Nucleic acid binder design. Structure first.
Lengths: 89, 131, 156, 80, 135, 198
RNA sequence: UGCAUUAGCUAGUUGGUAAGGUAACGGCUUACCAAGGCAACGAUGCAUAGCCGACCUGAGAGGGUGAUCGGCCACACUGGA
RNA sequence: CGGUACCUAAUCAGAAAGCCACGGCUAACUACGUGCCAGCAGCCGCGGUAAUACGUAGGUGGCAAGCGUUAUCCGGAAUUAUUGGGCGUAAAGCGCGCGUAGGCGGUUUUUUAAGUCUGAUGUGAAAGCCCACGGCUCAACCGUGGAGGGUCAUUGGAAACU
């Protein structure tokens, strides 16, 4: 259900993952909180964050949750820990 | 039978122009005569002469044809009846045969014509395939 | 000004006293490739001779096609009896656009821009009829627009 | 903040809040598109003999907390 | 035919007749059912070959085959090839075809399925089999 | 070309053009199966599908692969009298083994398909791919020297139009896509597709 | 849902008022309502059904397409409290 | 998953090609045992002391990892029809006529904007609306972004039909 989904994709070893955190009751293939971007976060380049950065107000304030790697890359983006600064604001 | 004069009277006229009969009659009307007025202004014929009577009187016709005894009356048709009409709008209308066709005209928003609305984006009405 | 092309042949052999001849009754298109595709027929006999002995009869009357060059801009078709074809005009930059038997007569009149909706009956003699129907009933554009009282483009 | 308010025609009579609707509308085709008349109804029974039987009315019949008339009424209009 | 009173039935094209009941047949043996699932794998049993006392003039001296695969259902088929082991109690598979100089017969029996013989008299048509596919 | 080389087989090849031919002491007709006989590419049971070999193996790929190349012809869906022909006839079988490119065009695909060709870039081991601009179809810089690699200063340079070369290991250019300037015209833009279309 | 070599269909019935209960709301049962309501819109009934894309493809018209393959229903020894 | 790839080039003219037939149409050659026999045998065949053809053959043909089929759709053949069927004979036109709803029966004028190529945009399902891509031994096949469309919604009111 609910952690940052590093979602399987592609042809034979083309794991073009997608930024997602699946629903609290849906599977990896099912419906979701919301699909936020089209990139493989395990890309050989980097985490390579391209998301709906403006959506940090909705899913973080309701439901969403990272897991141990992208909470870092989100707040060097100014999202995840920075939403704690927003909550303090 | 004459929703269009091209419906039943053309049974007469299609031979009448083979025999150069360049004048005939028509039921009295205002839209029917209007469309033939468009066509004679385009130069199909000499002119739509006018009505003798009031109600379904004889509008005179005066059918010129091609100088080469040719006829570009390439069929024109309609289906009017209480039971068959268009309870339906040319707030947009397209054209066929690259604008060569010019034929029947009937709607209600603001006066243009079939060929006089080819460019408006509130078009007209075309049935025939002239070339 | 007509068009050169071979159409077909036919070996007539009638129920007669002696051996049945096989006269190669042949139809041919002849000319020098202007646009006015003129075919004709002929009832001729010898294997190497009946081509020319039948083109003899073919050229007695070889028909005119008043050809709107480049392409007949609108849908161009025709019909007689059980014979007819159709041609939807397409882009001329498409190569050759044709049907099965009408391929070489598509090359005869220089348009090579319309397609050949190969319609009509299944009759071989009137296959020629179905072919020639499409392009025998033509009339040019500017002359018609002139004939209709208005200008060449007042009616456009 | 709005719901179903269509127009129809009443049929039958008894207690408890008419309007026994019979709406008329159009339905059409694919290859030729013949939009032509058809209908759809919602039965109930007489208001207090306020709804005149045979009444081409702006229809519906109020929200059901018992068992004879279906859903959100608007107002009785015209007799037919 | 009209168009407006054609709404009670559209002006359209026409329908199909019977074709090859055996190509696309199945069987469910649960409750005396009779199934169809469109498979070439449908079977029969090897029975018979022969003809009867003529009326019509069709001249041909070639093998008839009431001869089929595993589980018994009566048909009329063909046994291709001259060398054949199709007398009784055989299992085969079947495909289609007709070679000339054969009256009306229009199916076949594949060579070397379960219980038949092989092809002998053709040596210039050599390199078939197309799947285990070398040169 | 034609499944043949004119050093030994100039005969079934309508055009092989590798050598002296065999019209001198031999009969130059054919060794088999690809002379001018009744092969069906015509009114469709006629006498030109031996020249379907002139159509197919000209650009290398075989049928169901040349069939891939003709739908690639239909891909550039501009003027399908010319826009189909230009890229249908836009490959290289002239950089390949024997005669002058360095000495690499004729006995075609022996040696230049090294697998170590080391083009300007990473690697493109197969000239079936129409080479790209800047991506120079070079040979292995570490095993470079051959009679087919550095012989372009003497035998022949300049593969077709907008497709040039160098001398140091014969680095191609392919600066622009090749038009019909130095591209072939043996594949008919009209008839050869009328075998396919009409 | 489709289908009469399936037609006349149906009877607190036809689903408001009062009691009850759904986060919601009801004939869901009950004291009243007309035989009414349903109709060859082939209702009834028979057959069938997880549904879409999916592909191929007739000139365009545009469509048949579920195996997979994806999405969206139902069932997890059958059944019953 | 990889002491394999990259590489030395080790390697040498090396370590990597079949079809119906040789039948008119099947282009694959004429021959023999072949005398409508065997049997190859696709439109159709051949074969009877002169078989090209049965059987066989050196080549041999159309293309090559190549060779022919099997169930599905369509090309073929709009030989499946608004578009893209007609009905005397041919695919089909009623002993008959008489009849309600109807389909359609002739209209001449005139108002609405409801529909008769929405305005413009948020705006669009894959093997499937335009280009850019990267990898693909080419490929085999994969995916990516814009165009997000120019495709629905959303706003419009008004002819010469209604």
């Amino acid at each position: 259900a609910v952690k940052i989904r590093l979602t399987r994709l592609g042809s034979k070893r083309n794991p073009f993952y997608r930024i997602v955190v699946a629903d609290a009751r849906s599977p990896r293939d099912g419906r979701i909180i919301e699909q936020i971007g089209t990139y493989n976060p395990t890309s050989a380049n980097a985490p390579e964050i391209k998301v709906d950065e403006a959506l940090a107000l909705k899913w973080l304030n309701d439901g969403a949750k990272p897991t141990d790697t992208v909470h870092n890359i989100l707040s060097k983006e100014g999202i995840m820990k920075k939403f704690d600064e927003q909550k303090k604001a | 039978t004459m929703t269009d004069p091209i419906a039943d009277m053309l049974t007469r006229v299609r031979n009448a122009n083979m025999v150069r009969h360049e004048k005939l009659e028509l039921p009295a009307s205002n839209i029917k005569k209007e469309i033939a007025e468009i066509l004679k202004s385009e130069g199909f014929i000499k002119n739509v002469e006018y009505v003798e009577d009031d109600k379904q009187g004889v509008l005179r016709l005066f059918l010129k044809y091609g100088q080469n005894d040719e006829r570009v009356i390439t069929g024109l048709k309609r289906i009017s009846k209480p039971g068959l009409r268009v309870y339906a709008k040319a707030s947009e209308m397209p054209k066929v045969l690259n604008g060569l066709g010019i034929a029947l005209v009937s709607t209600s928003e603001g006066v243009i014509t079939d060929k006089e609305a080819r460019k408006r984006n509130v078009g007209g009405e075309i049935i025939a395939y002239v070339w | 000004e007509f068009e050169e092309r071979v159409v077909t042949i036919n070996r007539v052999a009638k129920v007669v006293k002696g051996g049945r001849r096989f006269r190669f009754t042949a139809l041919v298109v002849v000319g020098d490739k202007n646009g006015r595709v003129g075919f004709g027929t002929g009832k001729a006999q010898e294997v190497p001779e009946a081509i020319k002995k039948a083109v003899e009869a073919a050229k007695k009357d070889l028909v005119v096609v008043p050809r709107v060059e480049g392409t007949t801009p609108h849908t161009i078709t025709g019909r007689y009896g059980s014979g007819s074809v159709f041609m939807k005009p397409a882009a001329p930059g498409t190569g050759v656009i044709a049907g099965g038997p009408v391929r070489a007569v598509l090359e005869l009149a220089g348009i090579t821009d319309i397609l050949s909706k190969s319609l009509g009956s299944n009759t071989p003699i009137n296959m020629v009829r179905a072919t020639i129907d499409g392009l025998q009933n033509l009339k040019n554009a500017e002359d018609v627009a002139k004939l209709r009282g208005k200008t060449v483009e007042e009616l456009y | 903040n709005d719901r179903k308010v269509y127009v129809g025609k009443v049929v039958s009579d008894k207690m408890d809040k008419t309007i026994t609707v019979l709406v008329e509308t159009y339905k059409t085709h694919k290859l030729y598109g013949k939009r032509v008349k058809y209908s759809k109804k919602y039965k109930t029974h007489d208001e207090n003999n306020s709804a005149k039987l045979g009444d081409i009315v702006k229809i519906q019949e109020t929200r059901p907390l018992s068992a004879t008339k279906r859903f959100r009424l608007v107002e009785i209009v015209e007799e037919s | 035919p009209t168009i407006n009173q054609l709404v009670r039935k559209p002006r359209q094209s026409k329908i199909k007749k019977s074709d090859s009941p055996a190509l696309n047949k199945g069987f469910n043996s649960k409750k005396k059912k009779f199934t169809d699932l469109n498979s070439p794998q449908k079977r029969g049993v090897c029975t018979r070959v022969g003809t009867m006392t003529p009326k019509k003039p069709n001249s041909a001296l070639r093998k008839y085959a009431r001869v089929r695969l595993s589980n018994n259902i009566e048909i009329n088929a063909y046994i291709p090839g001259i060398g054949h082991n199709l007398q009784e109690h055989s299992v085969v598979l079947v495909r289609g075809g007709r070679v000339k100089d054969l009256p009306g017969v229009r199916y076949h029996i594949v060579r070397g399925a379960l219980d038949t013989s092989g092809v002998d008299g053709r040596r210039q048509g050599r390199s078939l089999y197309g799947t285990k596919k070398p040169k | 070309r034609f499944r043949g080389s004119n050093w030994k087989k100039s005969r079934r090849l309508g055009i092989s053009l590798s050598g002296t031919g065999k019209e001198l002491e031999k009969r130059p007709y054919a060794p088999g199966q690809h002379g001018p006989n009744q092969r069906k590419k015509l009114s469709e049971y006629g006498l030109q599908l031996r020249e379907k070999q002139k159509l197919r193996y000209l650009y290398g790929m075989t049928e169901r692969q040349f069939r891939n190349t003709f739908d690639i012809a239909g891909k550039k869906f501009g003027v399908h009298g010319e826009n189909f022909m230009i890229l249908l006839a836009s490959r290289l079988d002239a950089v390949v083994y024997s005669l002058g490119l360095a000495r690499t065009r004729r006995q075609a695909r022996q040696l230049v398909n090294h697998g170590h060709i080391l083009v300007d870039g990473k690697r493109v081991d197969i000239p079936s791919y129409s080479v790209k601009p800047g991506q120079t179809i070079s040979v292995r810089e570490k095993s470079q020297k051959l009679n087919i690699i550095v012989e372009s200063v003497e035998i022949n340079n300049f593969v077709p139009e907008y497709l040039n070369f160098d001398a140091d290991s014969l680095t191609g250019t392919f600066v622009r896509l090749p038009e019909r300037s130095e591209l072939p015209a043996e594949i008919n833009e009209q008839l050869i597709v009328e075998y396919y279309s009409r």
